[PDB]
Each structure stands twice: as C-alpha cells, then as structure tokens.
Amino acid sequence: SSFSQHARTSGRVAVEEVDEEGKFVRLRNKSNEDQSMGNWQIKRQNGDDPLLTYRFPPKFTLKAGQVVTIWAAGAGATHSPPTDLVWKAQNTWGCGNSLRTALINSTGEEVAMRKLVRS
C-alpha cells in the first residue's frame, strides 16, 4: 500500500492504526489490564512540518483490550468518549511520505510509536 509500517510498543498501549490520509489515529490497549492515560500525549511528526501535539484529558482510562480513536476535525466523526474522541481544533493529522505517530506518557517518555514511510 506504498507505505511500509514500523512499530514499537514498550508498555500496554500500542499505536495500532494510522490513517494514511490523516483522518484518525487509533490506539489499542493490547494487554489484559486497564491503562491510565491521563495527560498522555500523541505527537505526530510529518516530514519537516511543525510538530502536532494532542493531549488526553487529565483523567482517561483505556480499558483492557479496548480501542480509542482520535479523529481529526475534518473526518466528520461523532465525538463519543471513551472510544471516539474528536480533535476539534485540528483539521487533519497530516499527510506526506513519512508519518510518525508517538504516544507519550504523563512523565514525558515515548512508550509507543508507529511510523509509515513511502518509497
């Protein structure tokens, strides 16, 4: 699909799917235990563009095995916590030939990443 994928997951939550056309980022708690994600951040680096930062609410739990999808404002999704969050101030996650989406925890450490790169 022109994009190759590379992923690192060091804790319970993975960056499971990144839409190539910038509509959403999808996280999955791939473990059997709930994950507190209060004040976690998704950081999206597209090529040489300015960095995009989405902050989770000060309290947020991704339950065991469950998924949360963060939608860009332009996708037209329905805001419905905790499975579907809309990023109302940002129109797209961004496109290009190198899309890097990192999950950062509350103390500033990168705990998961998914990178898409096109030939």
Partner: protein
C-alpha cells in the same frame, strides 16, 4: 522487498540472533557468530560506528564473514531502514 526484510524492519530487534537480519544466510551467520557478531544488535553497532556508510559497511561485511553482493546489499538496506525508524 523480502519477507525477512519486512519482518526485521517492522519492529525493534532486541536480542534477535544475527540470522534474523535480511541478507544473513546460514554460512554468513555462522561466520559472523564466530567473529563475535552473534546478535543483530551487534551488527547494528558496527553499522553505526561506520556512520551508516554503505560502502564501508558492505566492504566490512564481505571481508569479515564472506558476504556476497546481494547479501551485503540486503543487510545494509535492512539496517538503514531499521535505524531510520527506530533510532
């Protein structure tokens, strides 16, 4: 691109054996282990101290463990893609 390449570059390598690296066939992998490059990360290290340079790396792999051109090309390519994603 090969399956071995895609499986190696898709995720962190940790302590995978040197044969997990694309291009590392059976004899090549045995020769690398005898020379102390038993894990993929040790070959990564050599790639990094050669400053990711293709010609230096492929010449080192050929002279140290007898890699042919296709093997050294695929090992180099796999390490460069891995490092671009994970370093």
């Amino acid at each position: 691109t090969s399956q071995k390449h895609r499986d190696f570059v898709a995720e962190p390598m940790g302590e995978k054996p040197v044969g997990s690296l694309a291009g590392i066939g059976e004899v090549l992998g045995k020769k690398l282990e005898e020379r102390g490059f038993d894990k993929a990360y040790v070959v990564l290290g050599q790639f990094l101290v050669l400053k990711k340079d293709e010609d230096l790396f492929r010449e080192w792999l050929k002279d140290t463990a007898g890699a042919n051109a296709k093997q050294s090309r695929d090992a180099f390519g796999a390490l460069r893609e891995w490092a671009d994603a994970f370093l």
